[PDB]
Amino acid sequence: MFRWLFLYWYNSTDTPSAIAKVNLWSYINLRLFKARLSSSIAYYILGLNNLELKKLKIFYKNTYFDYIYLKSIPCLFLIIFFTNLYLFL
Amino acid sequence: RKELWRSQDALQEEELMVNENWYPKNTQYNIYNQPDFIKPKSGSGAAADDIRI
Amino acid sequence: SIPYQEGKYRPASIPMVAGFFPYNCYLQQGKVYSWCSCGISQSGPWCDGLCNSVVTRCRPVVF
Amino acid sequence: YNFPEYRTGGVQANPGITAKRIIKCIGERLRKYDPARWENVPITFKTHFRDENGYSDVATSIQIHDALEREFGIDIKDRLALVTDVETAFYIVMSHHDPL
Amino acid sequence: KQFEERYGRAGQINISKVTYSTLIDVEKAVLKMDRLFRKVAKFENRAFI
Amino acid sequence: MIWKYLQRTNRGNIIQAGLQHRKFENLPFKQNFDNLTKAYDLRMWYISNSPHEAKNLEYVNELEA
Amino acid sequence: VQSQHSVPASPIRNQRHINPVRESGPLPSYDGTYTMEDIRAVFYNTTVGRDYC
Amino acid sequence: KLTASDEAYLNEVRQRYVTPDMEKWAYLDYKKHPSTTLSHYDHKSKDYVESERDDYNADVATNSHNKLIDDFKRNLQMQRKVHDILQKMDRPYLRGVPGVTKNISAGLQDYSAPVSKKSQSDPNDFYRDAYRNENRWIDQSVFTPKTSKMTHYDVEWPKELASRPVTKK
Amino acid sequence: MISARAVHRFLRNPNLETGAAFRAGTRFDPFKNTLTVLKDPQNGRTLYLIGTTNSSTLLANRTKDLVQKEKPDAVFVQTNKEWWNLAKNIQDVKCQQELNRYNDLLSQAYTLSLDNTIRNLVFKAKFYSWLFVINWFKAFPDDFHPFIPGLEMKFAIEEANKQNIPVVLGGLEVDDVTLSALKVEPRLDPFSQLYYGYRALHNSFWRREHFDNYATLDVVGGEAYAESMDRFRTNWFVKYFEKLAPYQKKIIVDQKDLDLFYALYRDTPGKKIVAVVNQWHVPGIENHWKSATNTHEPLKAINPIGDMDINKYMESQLVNDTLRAFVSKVGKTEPATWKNYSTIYHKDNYEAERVRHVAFVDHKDPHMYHGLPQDYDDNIKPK
Amino acid sequence: PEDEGIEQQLDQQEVLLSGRYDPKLYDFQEGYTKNPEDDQTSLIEKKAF
Ligand SMILES: CCCCCCCCCCCCCCCCCC(=O)OC[C@H](COP(=O)([O-])OCC(O)COP(=O)([O-])OC[C@@H](COC(=O)CCCCCCCCCCCCCCCCC)OC(=O)CCCCCCCCCCCCCCCCC)OC(=O)CCCCCCCCCCCCCCCCC
Numbered sequence A: 001m002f003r004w005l006f007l008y009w010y011n012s013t014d015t016p017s018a019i020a021k022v023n024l025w026s027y028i029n030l031r032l033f034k035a036r037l038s039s040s041i042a043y044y045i046l047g048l049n050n051l052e053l054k055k056l057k058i059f060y061k062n063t064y065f066d067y068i069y070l071k072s073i074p075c076l077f078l079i080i081f082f083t084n085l086y087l088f089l
Numbered sequence B: 001r002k003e004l005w006r007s008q009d010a011l012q013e014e015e016l017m018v019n020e021n022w023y024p025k026n027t028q029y030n031i032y033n034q035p036d037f038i039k040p041k042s043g044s045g046a047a048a049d050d051i052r053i
Numbered sequence C: 001s002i003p004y005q006e007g008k009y010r011p012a013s014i015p016m017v018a019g020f021f022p023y024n025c026y027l028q029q030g031k032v033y034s035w036c037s038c039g040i041s042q043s044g045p046w047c048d049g050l051c052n053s054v055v056t057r058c059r060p061v062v063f
Numbered sequence D: 001y002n003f004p005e006y007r008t009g010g011v012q013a014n015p016g017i018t019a020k021r022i023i024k025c026i027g028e029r030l031r032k033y034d035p036a037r038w039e040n041v042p043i044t045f046k047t048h049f050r051d052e053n054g055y056s057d058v059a060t061s062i063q064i065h066d067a068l069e070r071e072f073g074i075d076i077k078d079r080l081a082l083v084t085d086v087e088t089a090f091y092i093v094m095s096h097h098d099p100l
Numbered sequence E: 001k002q003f004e005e006r007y008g009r010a011g012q013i014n015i016s017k018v019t020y021s022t023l024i025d026v027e028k029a030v031l032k033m034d035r036l037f038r039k040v041a042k043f044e045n046r047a048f049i
Numbered sequence F: 001m002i003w004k005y006l007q008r009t010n011r012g013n014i015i016q017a018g019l020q021h022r023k024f025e026n027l028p029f030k031q032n033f034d035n036l037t038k039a040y041d042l043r044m045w046y047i048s049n050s051p052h053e054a055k056n057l058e059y060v061n062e063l064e065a
Numbered sequence G: 001v002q003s004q005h006s007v008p009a010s011p012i013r014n015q016r017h018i019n020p021v022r023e024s025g026p027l028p029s030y031d032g033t034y035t036m037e038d039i040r041a042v043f044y045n046t047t048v049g050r051d052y053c
Numbered sequence H: 001k002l003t004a005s006d007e008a009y010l011n012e013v014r015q016r017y018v019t020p021d022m023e024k025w026a027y028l029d030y031k032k033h034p035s036t037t038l039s040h041y042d043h044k045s046k047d048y049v050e051s052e053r054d055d056y057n058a059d060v061a062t063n064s065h066n067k068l069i070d071d072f073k074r075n076l077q078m079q080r081k082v083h084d085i086l087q088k089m090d091r092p093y094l095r096g097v098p099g100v101t102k103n104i105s106a107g108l109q110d111y112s113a114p115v116s117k118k119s120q121s122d123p124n125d126f127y128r129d130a131y132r133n134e135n136r137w138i139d140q141s142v143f144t145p146k147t148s149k150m151t152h153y154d155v156e157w158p159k160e161l162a163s164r165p166v167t168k169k
Numbered sequence I: 001m002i003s004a005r006a007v008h009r010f011l012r013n014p015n016l017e018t019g020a021a022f023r024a025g026t027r028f029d030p031f032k033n034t035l036t037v038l039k040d041p042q043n044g045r046t047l048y049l050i051g052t053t054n055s056s057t058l059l060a061n062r063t064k065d066l067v068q069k070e071k072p073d074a075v076f077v078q079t080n081k082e083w084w085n086l087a088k089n090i091q092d093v094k095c096q097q098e099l100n101r102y103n104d105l106l107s108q109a110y111t112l113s114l115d116n117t118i119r120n121l122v123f124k125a126k127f128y129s130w131l132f133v134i135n136w137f138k139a140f141p142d143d144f145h146p147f148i149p150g151l152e153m154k155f156a157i158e159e160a161n162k163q164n165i166p167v168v169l170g171g172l173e174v175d176d177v178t179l180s181a182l183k184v185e186p187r188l189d190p191f192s193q194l195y196y197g198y199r200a201l202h203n204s205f206w207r208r209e210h211f212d213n214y215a216t217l218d219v220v221g222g223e224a225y226a227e228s229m230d231r232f233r234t235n236w237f238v239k240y241f242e243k244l245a246p247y248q249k250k251i252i253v254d255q256k257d258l259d260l261f262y263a264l265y266r267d268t269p270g271k272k273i274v275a276v277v278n279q280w281h282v283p284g285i286e287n288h289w290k291s292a293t294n295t296h297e298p299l300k301a302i303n304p305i306g307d308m309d310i311n312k313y314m315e316s317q318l319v320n321d322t323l324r325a326f327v328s329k330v331g332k333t334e335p336a337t338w339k340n341y342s343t344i345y346h347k348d349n350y351e352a353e354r355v356r357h358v359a360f361v362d363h364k365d366p367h368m369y370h371g372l373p374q375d376y377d378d379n380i381k382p383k
Numbered sequence J: 001p002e003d004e005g006i007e008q009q010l011d012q013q014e015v016l017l018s019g020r021y022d023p024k025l026y027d028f029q030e031g032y033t034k035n036p037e038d039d040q041t042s043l044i045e046k047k048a049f
C-alpha cells in the first residue's frame, strides 16, 4: 500500500528474487494494485536543498445540493428582477 | 548604459535590506513584534469612504 | 550574454538579417531585455534561444 | 550618486536580499488585496498561502504573481506554476534568468 | 510487530466519531449475521451431516 | 424566520448517515436474499470506511462468497 | 524473513539524470586554437567526390 | 578565525557525507564458472560436450555476476572519494554577510505554533534525505543482500542442478 | 505611543503545512475560550472578563460558581433594566433550552424607543429592513442567540444581588447609544446590504471558512457551538461582519467595545470586577485594557528572514558545483546544465533555451572560468 | 447454548478489546468540514462517548 512511486520503489522486500525462496505468490500482492497515486495534482519544484512536492487542490468534490441552492438563490432573484424590469420597461 | 540600470531608491532599499534587522515598516500593525515599530499615520478621512473591503 | 556596447558593437559572427527596417517597440523602465544578435530568434528582436542551437559566436545582448 | 553594479546576477548572488524583497512585495500585495486576513499575519519565508487543508486560492496566487512581476520586472508563467508559498515565489524568482 | 515496537507508529488516523461508531456497529451486525447464517446452515444441513 | 428554514440545513443532510438499526433488530431465520444482501452491504460499507487491513481482507473473502 | 528485513534491500532502477554532462565534448570556445567560427566556416566547403583530396 | 557556531555548523554538516559501509549489506562472493567443477563444461577435459547455448548462458550469468560485484566495489570507492572531497572542501559562504549569504546570527527560528506531532510519513522530508545527488554512486549499485542461507535453495538446488545427466548426442 | 498589536486575527498557523491529522488548532476549549483575567498593578485592580454567547448552561453555571468564589467588588453585565426585570420575573428555570423557550419574550428588551417624526420613520424603515437582511445573512437558529442575554447573565446578576455587590448594566447589543450612532450613520440600505453580503465572500478561503463554521453550527447545535467557540472563530466572525457591513460593523463592535472599556476602566467602583459581555467584544476590550495598562505579554521580535536556511541553500549550491566540476573533469567534457535538480518550470528539457552560469565582461575578466571545470585544479578545489 | 444476548455481549467485548479501535490511535475530527478541525461536540457528549 503506497501512494508515491519513490517511496514504493525505495525499499522493496517482496521482489521476485526474495519471494522465490518461499515459492509462494499471493494474488493480493499484485503490482497492478500495489501502488496508486492520489487524484490531486502534485508537481515538483526546486527547493533550498532538493526537489519538493507541491499539491494543487482547486475545488472540493463533496458539496451538496443544499449548499448549491443557497449559493444559487441570488442568481434566481437577479433573473426575476431583470425580467420584471424588462416587463415594466 | 553597459551596466544594468537600477534606481537610486532601489539601491537604497537594497542597502537597507543588507542590514540584519530589516523589516517592512509600512504596516498598520506591529506584526513582526519589533520594539522600535511606530504606528504609521492612517490615510483615512472623516467620510471613511474607502474603509470598505 | 553580453552587455550593451555604447555605440561600439561589432558582432562576433555574421548575423542573419532578420529585417531591413527596425522594430518600434515600447520598452518598460528598468526591465531587462535580451536583444537577439544572431538574427534567427523566433520571439522577435528579443532572444528566443535559437542562438544556442545555431552555430554562431553572436550572443544575446542583455540591456 | 551610487553607480549600479556591473555584474548581472545580483539577485542570484544575494539570496537573502531577493527573499526579503519577495517577502516585502508579497506582504504589501496581500495587505492591499485581503486586509482582513493578512493585516495581523506576518509574512516570513515559511509562510504559505493555502488553507488549513492544503487547497490554494487562485485569486491570491495570481495577485502574488502580479506583485512579483511588477517588483522584479519579469513575466511569471501562470500556466506552468502557481505561487502558493514564499518558497515557491523564491524558487520562481531565482529560476527567472533576468530578475531585477 | 518488531518494527512497530522499535519505530513507534506512523501517526494517528483522522476519522469522525460517527464513522467510528458506525464501524463498531457494522462489526457487531456482521458478527450477528454470521451467527445467524451458521445456525440456519446447521439446521438445513442437519440431515446430511 | 425565513432563514431558519432556508439557510439552516438538517444535521442529517451534512453528517454521515448511521446504520438503520430496525433493519437488523429482527430478521427471518432463512438464509435468503434479504439477509445475504444485508450482509454484503454491511461488509462493503465496512471495507469502504475502515482503516483496518486485517478485517477488510477477510471481509473481502467473505464478500466474494 | 528476519534477515531480509534486518538489512537494506537491493536498489531498484531510477531514471533521473544526476549532474548530467555534455554527450559531446566541451562547447567550442569564443577564442582559442579552435573556435565555433572555424566550425561555422565549414558548411560552405562541403564536397563528397569520387577521388581523395 | 572560526566562531563556535561556525565550528558546530561544520561538525553537523560534515555528517552528511559519511559512507554507509555497504560491505556489511552484501555478499561479495564471486561465482565460479561451472567449468571448474563439472568436467563436461571444461574445454580441456576429455569428456567435453560442445554446446553453444548452455555454455553461452553459463558464462553470461557468471560474467554478469562478477561485473555486478566489480562495479559495486568501484562505485563504493568512488563514493568514498567524493565524500572525502565534499568533507574537505572549503565553504566560502560561511564568511558571507549574515542575512544575505549566511543565516542570521540568531540562527534558524521556528515561528510556527504546532499543536500535534508531525507525521512520520512526510513525503518531502523522506525524499530530501532518500535521494541526493552526491550519493548517486551507491544508490544504483545492485548487490545480493545478506540473508540467511536456505538449504532447499542455496544447498539442495545447486546440487541437483549440477548433477543433471549429460548426453553426447 | 500607539500599541499597534495584533487584534481580530483568525488565521491559525500560516507557517505550517496542515492537513489530514495534522491540524492547525483546537477550537474546543469551554473555559479558556471565554474566561480572561486582566490586572492593573497601578490601581491594584483585577478584572475577570467573560465572553458569553448566552446559549450554554455549562458556561452559565461556571460563571455563577466563579462569581460565588471570587466575591467581586463590582459586576458589569452587558444587558439592560428591561431585560433584568423580565429575567427576574422569570423564575424556576435552570436550563438554557428552557430559557430559550422564552427568547421571544426576552426580545422585548430591544425597546429601541424613538419618535415617529418623518426622519425617524425613514430611519426605522431602513434600519428594520437592514436588520432583516443581516439576520438573513447570519442564519443563526433559535438555539444560538449570541445577542439575546440569557442564563449566564441572569445567574451573574442574581449572585451579585445575593452578595450585595454593585451591578452595572451596559445595554444590549443595540442599545440607545448604538441606535443613535446607527442613525447618525447614513450608509444603511437593505438592497446595498444584500449586494455587499452576497459579494463579500470574494475568496475560496472565505467561502470555505463560512461553510465550515455554519456546517459545524448546524451539526453540533447552539450549546455545543457556543462551548467550542474559539478566539480565532470569533475574530473570523468579526471580520465577516466587517465585510458584510463595515460602516455598521464599526459602530456595533469597535465603538461598543471602546465604550465598554471606558465603563470598566474609568467608572468601576471596586478593585475586583467581574464583567460579562458578548464574546466578540472581548478581544477589543482586552486589547484596550492591555494597551492602557502597559501589561501586554512580552513578545520576541521575529525576523522576516529568520526562518530561511540560507546556509543550507548555499551549501547545496556549492555541493552541486563541486559535483559538476568533478564529473566534468572525469568525463573530459563540460556540464550539460547548471540546474541542481531538473524541473519543468523552464522548458530547457525540450527547447533551445539552456541554463548555463557562465558570464564575463571581457577577455581579461577573472570570472571568465567561474562555473566551468577549468576553475578547479586536479584535486577538485577552486583556483 | 450460544444465547443471542450473551453472544452479543461477548462479541461487543471482542470487538472493543481487539485493540483496533483504541482511542489513542485516532484523531477525531468533524470530517464534513472543509478544513481539518477537532471534534466540536459538547463536554458532556465527549464524556458520554
Ligand atoms: C509614374 C512613376 C514615375 C516615376 C519616375 C522615377 C521616380 C524616381 C523616384 C526616386 C526615389 C524613389 C524612392 C523609393 C524607395 C524604395 C526603397 C525603400 O523605401 O526601402 C528602404 C527601406 C528603409 O526604410 P526606412 O525609410 O528606413 O523606414 C523604416 C521605418 O521603420 C519605417 O517606419 P516609419 O517611421 O516610416 O513609420 C511609418 C508609419 C507606420 O504606420 C503604419 O502602420 C503605416 C500606416 C499608417 C496609417 C496611414 C493611413 C493612410 C493609408 C495607409 C495605407 C497603408 C497602410 C498599411 C498598414 C499595414 C499594417 C499591417 O508611421 C506611423 O506610425 C504612422 C504615420 C502616419 C502619418 C500620416 C502621414 C500622411 C499619410 C501617409 C502615411 C503613410 C504611412 C506609411 C505607409 C508605409 C507602407 C504601409 O529598406 C527596407 O527595409 C525595405 C523594406 C521593404 C520595402 C518594400 C517597399 C518598396 C518601395 C518603397 C517606396 C515606395 C515608393 C512609391 C512611389 C510611387 C510613385 C508612382
Ligand SMILES: CCCCCCCCCCCCCCCCCC(=O)OC[C@H](COP(=O)([O-])OCC(O)COP(=O)([O-])OC[C@@H](COC(=O)CCCCCCCCCCCCCCCCC)OC(=O)CCCCCCCCCCCCCCCCC)OC(=O)CCCCCCCCCCCCCCCCC
Pocket: C021, C022, C023, C024, C025
Ligand atoms: C465605424 C468604424 C469602422 C472601421 C472599419 C475598419 C477600418 C478599415 C479597415 C482597416 C484595416 C486595418 C488592417 C491593418 C491592421 C493593423 C493592426 C495594428 O494596428 O497592429 C498594431 C501594431 C503593433 O502596435 P504596437 O506594438 O503598439 O507598435 C506601435 C508601433 O508604432 C509600430 O511601429 P513599427 O515601426 O514597429 O511598425 C509599423 C510599420 C512601420 O513600417 C512600415 O511602414 C512597414 C512597411 C514599409 C517599410 C518601409 C518604410 C519606407 C516607406 C515604404 C513605402 C511603401 C509603399 C508601398 C506599400 C505597398 C503597396 C501599396 O510596420 C508595419 O506596420 C509592418 C507592415 C508591413 C506590411 C505592409 C504592407 C501593406 C499592404 C497594404 C497597403 C495598402 C495601401 C493603400 C494606399 C491607399 C492610398 C493610395 O501597430 C501597427 O501596426 C501600427 C499601425 C496601426 C494600423 C494602421 C492601419 C492603417 C490602414 C491599413 C489599411 C490596409 C488596407 C485595407 C485592408 C482592409 C480592407 C480591404
Ligand SMILES: CCCCCCCCCCCCCCCCCC(=O)OC[C@H](COP(=O)([O-])OCC(O)COP(=O)([O-])OC[C@@H](COC(=O)CCCCCCCCCCCCCCCCC)OC(=O)CCCCCCCCCCCCCCCCC)OC(=O)CCCCCCCCCCCCCCCCC
Pocket: I114, I115, I116, I117, I118, I121
Ligand atoms: C386633509 C388632507 C388629507 C390628505 C393628506 C394627508 C397628508 C399627506 C400624506 C402624508 C402621508 C405620510 C405621513 C406624513 C406625516 C407623518 C407625521 C408623523 O409621523 O409624525 C410623528 C408624530 C409623533 O408621534 P410620536 O413621536 O410617536 O408620539 C407623539 C406623542 O403624542 C408625543 O407628543 P407630545 O404629547 O409631546 O406633543 C407633541 C405632538 C402634539 O400633537 C398633537 O397631538 C397635537 C394636535 C394639534 C392639532 C393637530 C392638527 C394640526 C396639524 C395638521 C397637520 C398639517 C396639515 C395637514 C393637511 C395638509 C393639507 C391641507 O406633536 C408631535 O409629537 C409632532 C407632530 C408633528 C407631525 C405631524 C404634522 C404633519 C401632519 C400632516 C402630514 C404632513 C405633510 C403635509 C403636506 C401638506 C402641508 C405641508 O406622530 C403623530 O403624532 C401622528 C398623529 C397622526 C397623524 C395622521 C396624519 C396627519 C393628519 C393631519 C390632520 C388632517 C385632517 C384630518 C383628516 C385627514 C384625512 C383622513
Ligand SMILES: CCCCCCCCCCCCCCCCCC(=O)OC[C@H](COP(=O)([O-])OCC(O)COP(=O)([O-])OC[C@@H](COC(=O)CCCCCCCCCCCCCCCCC)OC(=O)CCCCCCCCCCCCCCCCC)OC(=O)CCCCCCCCCCCCCCCCC
Pocket: I117, I118, I119, I120
Ligand atoms: C376638521 C378638523 C380635523 C382635525 C383632525 C386632527 C387629527 C389629529 C392630527 C395629528 C397630526 C398633527 C399633529 C400636529 C402637532 C404639532 C405640535 C407641534 O408643533 O409641536 C411639536 C413640534 C416638535 O417637532 P417634532 O415633531 O419633534 O419634529 C422636530 C423635527 O426637527 C422636524 O423635522 P423632521 O425631522 O420632521 O424633518 C422635516 C423634513 C425637513 O425637510 C423639509 O424641508 C421638508 C420639505 C421637503 C420637500 C417635500 C416635498 C413637498 C413640498 C413641501 C413644501 C414645503 C416645504 C418647506 C421647506 C422649507 C425649507 C426652508 O425632513 C426632511 O429632511 C424631509 C422629509 C420629507 C420626506 C417626504 C415625505 C412625504 C411628503 C411629505 C413631506 C412633509 C415634510 C414636512 C412639512 C412640514 C411643513 C412645511 O414643535 C415644533 O416644532 C413647533 C414649531 C411650530 C410649528 C407650527 C405649528 C402651528 C402651525 C400649523 C397649524 C396647521 C393647521 C392645519 C390643520 C389641518 C386640518 C384641519
Ligand SMILES: CCCCCCCCCCCCCCCCCC(=O)OC[C@H](COP(=O)([O-])OCC(O)COP(=O)([O-])OC[C@@H](COC(=O)CCCCCCCCCCCCCCCCC)OC(=O)CCCCCCCCCCCCCCCCC)OC(=O)CCCCCCCCCCCCCCCCC
Pocket: F001, F002, I053, I107, I110, I128, I129, I131, I132, I133, I134, I135, I138, I140, I141, I142, I143, I144, I145, I146, I147, I148, I173, I174, I190, I191, I234, I237, I238, I240, I241, I244, I252, I278, I279, I280
Ligand atoms: C406585519 C406588518 C408589517 C411589519 C411590521 C413591523 C415588524 C413587526 C414584526 C417584528 C417586530 C420586531 C422587530 C425586530 C425587533 C428586534 C429583534 C431582535 O432582537 O433581533 C436582533 C437579532 C437578535 O437575534 P440573535 O441574538 O442573533 O439570535 C438569533 C436567533 O435566531 C433569534 O432570532 P430572532 O428571533 O431574534 O430574530 C430577529 C428578527 C425577528 O423578526 C423577524 O423574524 C421578522 C418578522 C416579520 C417578517 C417575517 C417575514 C417572513 C417571510 C416568510 C413568509 C412568507 C413571505 C411571503 C412574502 C411574499 C411577498 C414578497 O429580527 C428581524 O429580522 C426584524 C425585522 C423587522 C422588519 C420586517 C420587514 C422586513 C422586510 C424585508 C423585505 C425584503 C428585503 C428588501 C427587498 C428585497 C427585494 C427587492 O440580531 C441582532 O441583535 C443584530 C445585532 C447587530 C449586529 C449583527 C451582526 C451579524 C453578523 C455577525 C454574526 C456573528 C457575530 C459574532 C460571533 C458570535 C457571537 C460571539
Ligand SMILES: CCCCCCCCCCCCCCCCCC(=O)OC[C@H](COP(=O)([O-])OCC[N+](C)(C)C)OC(=O)CCCCCCCCCCCCCCCCC
Pocket: I108, I110, I111, I112, I113, I114, I116, I121, I124, I125, I126, I128, I129
Ligand atoms: C390596500 C392597502 C394596502 C396597504 C399595504 C401596505 C404595505 C406596506 C409594507 C411596508 C413594509 C416596510 C418594511 C420595512 C420596515 C418598516 C418599519 C418597521 O419595521 O415597522 C416597525 C416600526 C417600528 O415601530 P416600533 O418601534 O413601535 O416597534 C415596536 C416593536 N419594538 C418594541 C420591538 C420596537 O413601526 C413604525 O415605525 C411605524 C410603522 C407604521 C407606519 C405607517 C405609515 C403609514 C402607512 C400608510 C399605508 C401604507 C403605504 C401606502 C400603500 C399604498 C398602496 C397602494
Ligand SMILES: COC1=C(OC)C(=O)C(C/C=C(/C)CC/C=C(\C)CC/C=C(\C)CC/C=C(\C)CC/C=C(\C)CC/C=C(\C)CC/C=C(/C)CCC=C(C)C)=C(C)C1=O
Pocket: F012, F017, F018, F019, F020, F021
Ligand atoms: C395536474 O397536476 C400537475 C401536474 O401534472 C401531473 C404538473 O406537472 C404540475 C407541475 C409542477 C410541479 C412542481 C411538479 C409536481 C410534481 C410532483 C409533486 C412529483 C415529484 C415529487 C418529488 C420529486 C418528491 C419526491 C421526494 C420524496 C417523496 C421525499 C422522500 C424522503 C424520504 C424517503 C426520507 C428518508 C429519510 C429517512 C428515513 C431519515 C433517515 C435518517 C437517518 C439519521 C439515518 C438512520 C440513522 C440511524 C443512526 C438510525 C403541477 C403543479 C400539477 O398540479
Ligand code: FES
Pocket: C035, C036, C037, C038, C039, C040, C041, C042, C047, C048, C049, C050, C051, C052, C058, C059, C060, C061
Ligand atoms: S541571440 Fe538570436 S536567439 Fe539568442
